[PDB]
Amino acid sequence: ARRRRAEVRQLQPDLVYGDVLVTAFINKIMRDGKKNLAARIFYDACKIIQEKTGQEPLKVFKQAVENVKPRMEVRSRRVGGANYQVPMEVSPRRQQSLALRWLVQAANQRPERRAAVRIAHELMDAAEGKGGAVKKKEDVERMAEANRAYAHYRW
Amino acid sequence: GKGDRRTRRGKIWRGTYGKYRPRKK
Amino acid sequence: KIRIKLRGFDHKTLDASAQKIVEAARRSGAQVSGPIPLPTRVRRFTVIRGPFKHKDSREHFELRTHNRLVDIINPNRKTIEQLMTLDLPTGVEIEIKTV
Amino acid sequence: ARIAGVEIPRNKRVDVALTYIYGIGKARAKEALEKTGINPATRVKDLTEAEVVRLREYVENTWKLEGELRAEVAANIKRLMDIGCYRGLRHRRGLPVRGQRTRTNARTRKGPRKTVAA
Amino acid sequence: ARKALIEKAKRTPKFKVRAYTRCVRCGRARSVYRFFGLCRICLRELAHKGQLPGVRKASW
Amino acid sequence: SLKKGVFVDDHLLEKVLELNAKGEKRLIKTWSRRSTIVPEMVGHTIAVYNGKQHVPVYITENMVGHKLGEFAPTRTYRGHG
């Protein structure tokens, strides 16, 4: 991305809940190119957010996503001394991706044998706040706390 | 998987036919 | 009921050898239904570009075999004769069968 | 229960637990399952000793398993060795016995690596 | 290849399994095309002068 | 594996089938390692070629379906340093 501003890949909205967030999330669940499996997993998940919990599974997702969204992070930078760790804020775009990423990877670490139940529980625990993928968002922010000394080196 | 000659998936890969991939259509 | 099979390599000479026959038939005889371009069958050769060894850097050529079919429905002995000795092909091959 | 010497399969599923016997699996199983008119889909945990003894009797009688099976493949190879035979030599030195370049990994047959200097 | 080698290619009888292709412009036993009887350097050489009928270089 | 088959070369096949019905038996050098062995081979002493020389190989009843080059190995080894 030397010359350009590298404009953002844009996705077609969902065919059920009609939301881009969902598709962009669906993609991350997709192993080796299978979209069909990706949705059939996710859609079974919000089935689980229904019989289990009386709440509305869409609403959980935006919430569970907004809780696992990191507010600040520590980027490497090189200077008139050695390499450092400098705290800055995640751009809106960036916060997106990380939350979607961490969500899934956390999900797969959950012990539940079936894929949908994994993302189900995680996304629930995520929204209620106690989720493993949240432990990350938190943690990342905690790094940029302790390094606030180096926060004068930001760009 | 693609190396079990004693399976459907395997046979297809090796390109061959047999008791595990009998030829019918 | 008797049809003509046209083949060849250059479609410059192949096309131009259908069009003479169309009017050595239409004007020159009974009804003949226009040239139909049967699909081209393509032989391809891909080959290492140097004498010894550079396994990347190929060059490939191809030999294009083009087909063209014209149907002629009814016999006129001027069609038979004009299409016999007035042959003016070059690298084209022609065929005819009664059946 | 127990078949072919001791070899107890348990729980699981009956056509599967049949694989766990020496000399048997896949085919030789799903065959003797209907040949004894037994449901394969059932579980070896529970079934009538009826369908149990019909089942051991077939198998243990039909073909050779376990001890005598291993004893036969033993003396078969003993036969290839000591007859001075080629394949015999490849058994004698523990090297790969069919086709099989040995300049690089034979490892399954060769053992783990024993490295040396350049 | 050598002479008696380009020759023996032609002497085809005695166990036709032994008949192997050979280039008509080389003697080259390797990478000979059934269709042309030429080998792969020669195919590239003759195709480039136009002396291979209706044989054009491909691009796509 | 052949079966309608069992290929043996006719050259030694002669000299062996003879050494039954001639009544007499001795040492016979052949290049044919492609051939199968027995029945009337057993007890004959056949010299098989490895590419280098002719190896004496004594013959018995469990050598039966085995080609003549099984018993004449082609490569010299004795391991490494």
Add this chain to the structure above:
Amino acid sequence: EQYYGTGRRKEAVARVFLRPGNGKVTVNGQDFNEYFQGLVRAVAALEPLRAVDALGHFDAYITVRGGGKSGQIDAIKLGIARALVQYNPDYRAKLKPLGFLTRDARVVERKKYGKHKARRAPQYSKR
């Protein structure tokens, strides 16, 4: 008596026939949801209907060939977008901003000599 449209995606091509009715859709001698059962991107093809407000106005009989199940679906979507643009082509007005009037130029990129997949290249060795 009817309206027509043409669309194609990746060597797959679609014939679209629109003759008003309950909203019944026929594909290659089949119910729409039978042929496409289990494929979750299916309903995206008739997306220009939903945005044209015509629901149970039109039935559909549709032939399609080439490519594969899930790229044929994009070929139908252009069919319906070129058929709906026939009945009162004031429906061009909002179709094209939605982007249902453009054909996908996107196709399989070929293979290159020296490579493996036409971009994907063999592992570098160096030593």
Add this chain to the structure above:
RNA sequence: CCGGGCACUCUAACGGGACUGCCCGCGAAAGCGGGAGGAAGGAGGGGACGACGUCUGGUCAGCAUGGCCCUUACGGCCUGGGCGACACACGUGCUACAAUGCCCACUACAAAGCGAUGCCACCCGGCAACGGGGAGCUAAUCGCAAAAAGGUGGGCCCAGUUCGGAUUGGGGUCUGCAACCCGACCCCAUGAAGCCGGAAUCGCUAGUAAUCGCGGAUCAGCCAUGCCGCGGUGAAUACG
């Protein structure tokens, strides 16, 4: 399938078609942003194409060729062997270590190529490889052909396992004069290492990367997981 038509899909030749030519912004211009076009733009995406030259680069084993060199051999024919060796070391790969996964049954959707010294439908024998028979096609006209993933349905229940199929034993099929060394394939038994890989390291910016099958060249057969190609589904991410 028939009549019928070729309108469509398509097949293949010929043109058309966007040139920053048009709208505001900037600017001195070239250009650049932005707008509406349009199927398409800012060289539309991909080929083919590779300056004077450099590496005393590669190739005397494709061929050519100056020079030196052997002349019952440094030439020539054959039978057999070797190029396939195995204490080990490196490069490119393939199949995996599983549950977004394995197996079984059913159900769909491609493109590009090849074949009347061949491709072989369909029927019978065989668990099968294959073998008998045997119709069509000089092939948009018959055959390779089943595409695979996917889809549906049921099974497995986290286990070195219905994971994974290396190794070995026995039984066979085929090509071929001939499968010991060295073939490919089928069945039965055997079921190993392996539970995501130290230091280190590669590819890829979109219909790409991943992943899934398919065809051809060479070719009797084949050690092809290779190579050259074809379509199927189809991400992520570029602050800088």
